Structures are given as structure tokens and as C-alpha cells.
Design a protein around this nucleic acid. Sequence first.
DNA 1: AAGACGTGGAC
DNA 2: GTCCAGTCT
Length: 393
Amino acid sequence: LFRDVAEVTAFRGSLLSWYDQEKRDLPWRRRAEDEMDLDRRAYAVWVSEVMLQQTQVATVINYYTGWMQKWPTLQDLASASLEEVNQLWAGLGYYSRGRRLQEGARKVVEELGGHMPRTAETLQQLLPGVGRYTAGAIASIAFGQATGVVDGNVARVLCRVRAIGADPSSTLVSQQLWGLAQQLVDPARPGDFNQAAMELGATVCTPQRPLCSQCPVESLCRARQRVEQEQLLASGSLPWDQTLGVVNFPRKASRKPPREESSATCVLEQPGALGAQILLVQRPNSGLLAGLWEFPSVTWEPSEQLQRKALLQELQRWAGPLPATHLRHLGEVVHTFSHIKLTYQVYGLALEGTVPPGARWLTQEEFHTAAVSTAMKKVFRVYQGQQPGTCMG
DNA sequence: AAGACGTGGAC
DNA sequence: GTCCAGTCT
Ligand code: SF4
């Protein structure tokens, strides 16, 4: 931790001064700063910080304002359906986030009388989907509590400023980072300080090509001070790799490679009054892509003939007997999840001329807005481009 | 206390 | 292509 109170003070002043001048104009920042009711403000921050988990700012811009305009308050979100939530979340990824946001709103309404808890400890304790980061973000930004937070951005800044080379995922290191953040967080402007540290990590102290020469905390940064000395060395010196400079920190966490999986899926198309329709069925409410809609799918089979037989069996559960000779193998889609690389073999079957529950026939316009994973949107685009004679293009 | 859980923007 | 932008169990 920082040993000199003078430095802690300078860190805060420099960072906040830079932030007040350089911060990006972000929709949830404006909305939180401008909302005067505390339960509305806290809800607005809550939504944005859930959407931002493992998701880039540029992506969340496309979702946040639409969410807040539809469901401006806890109570609006609490009364909505999970199907509606999943439609709005389609494309954001990690769909349990949307589900827990709505469950959390229901819990605040039903069990806490509509009142958002006002401290990071009670937010974390009471709200599913709200871990230590989101709770401290809501508490500092919405309520002004002097709690510091560590996300990926802040961990990178702190590991460079303090030259921490050990593995940041380790319990010892993660503990040091949270203590540093709690030491540094400005008591009078805790929310802006936390947003400023994240902003610095996102726009200046970046994963690669950090802009140290424009950085507000350069003179306090240990990695920078070591790089400045080594820039001058007129002779080589023969785990710190001089050619990486400050990007030596943090130690690059290596992801476990993804499990390979394969599946076969079929787009079934039929004419309709208001346009052609395709068949969607609903996934189970647990596990991968829980509760989202998809084209009927079966697991992989060790021969083409077996694969077609399984697919037609699955398809017939939902549509009745179908012409097997019209089934076409159209292509494949290789879709990456964090832990699975899933290869879908795409089939189509267009019919030339009742619906069990758990199935839906949708037009092209209805499908574009439906609660479907991006994997299935890719599948549909293969069908669109490759199925002879389709009208869905 | 590693693995489940989506997707895409940058380089 | 590879990396990075949290929560829960
Ligand atoms: S001087 Fe460079 S490495 Fe240090 S905090 Fe600033 S941008 Fe990051």
C-alpha cells in the first residue's frame, strides 16, 4: 500500500482534475448525475454497471438508453416479464445478468418496499447479480459512499502504478488491489474517483500502447519511472521484459482453451399470411443460453444419414410429418463462447404449402427482435444466403 | 476456487 | 488469430 499520505492526496487530485476535463460523455453518467431521486439514481447506475460486466462501453451504448426508456424505474422493471427482458438483452451476452436484474428489482419492490439499500455491503448481500464491484459502483456513484472498486481497468492501472508482477487473480494480489483502491478512493468525490480510475484504464492506461506521456499520474507510477530509466540505457543489460515496458504489468492471465462441441440445427420455413415464417423452439430455463429461442437442434451424429434422421425426428415433434427429401445441408457456423467453441451444422427445409407450446412461428421481422442468441442469428444468415428459393432473404 | 456463463471491439 | 471488457458456485 502507499506509504506516503502526500502521494495519496496527489493521486486523487491529479486523477479527478484530469477526469473533470477529459471524461467521455456517457449516457449512464449523465443520467445518474441528473437524477435527483435516490432510488431512481441507484437503479440507473445498477442497470449500467450490470450491462458493463465483461462488456465494452461501445457495446452498452447500444442497449442502455433503450432499456431505461422502456423501464425507467425499479417498479417498471419488476412488473415486466423475463421474455421482455431477454428480448432487450439479446446480443449482450451472459443472459443471467438480465434475469437477475429483474429478479433484483422484484426483490427490492416486494421485500424492501421499493427502497434500494444504500451501502455496498447491503447491496451485495441483497441483490443477485451484484458482486463486490457492482455494489461498490452503485454505492459510490449513486449514494456517495467512500468505497473503492477494482475492475479490469483499475487492476491494470494499480498493477502498473505499484509495479505488481504477481498473478492478479491470486487471492493475495486481489486483496492488495482492493486495499489500494480503498486507500485511494477520494472521500469527498468517491463516485467520480472510481469512474476516473476506470476511465484512465480505458482511455490512457490501456492494455497496449498506453499514453503515459499524457497520463495524469505518470510521476507517481512505478512502472513508468522504471521505463523512463531504461529508455536511456545506451547498452543492453545481459521476468521483466524491457521491450514490453509498462505492459509487463499486470501478468497476462492465460485463458483455458475452449471445449469443442458440435450440433446440428434446422431452419424450417413455410408460407404465411403476413409473410413467410420460420420455426423457433424455447431452450430450457437453465444452463447455456437459458430460456432463449433457437432453431430446433440435435446433437451431432457420426454419419450424415443418422444426422438427418435425428433432425427430422426433432423437427417432427413440432411441425408434424415433413418431406425428408427436401432437407438441405446448407453450411456451418463456428460460434465462440468463453468456455465452448460450438460448431453448428446448418440445415434448411422449406415447405411448399396447430403449434405445441414451447414453439413459435415467426416472420423475419419478428425474429430480428426476438430473444435469440447471436449464434442463432448467424445460423439464420447462413439459411438466408444459401437456401434455394427462400423468401426470408 | 476453477469452471460456467456470450459477445465483440482493438490490435 | 488473441486479448480483454464480473458473478456465482
Ligand atoms: S504512466 Fe503509463 S503505465 Fe503508469 S498509470 Fe499512467 S498510462 Fe499507466
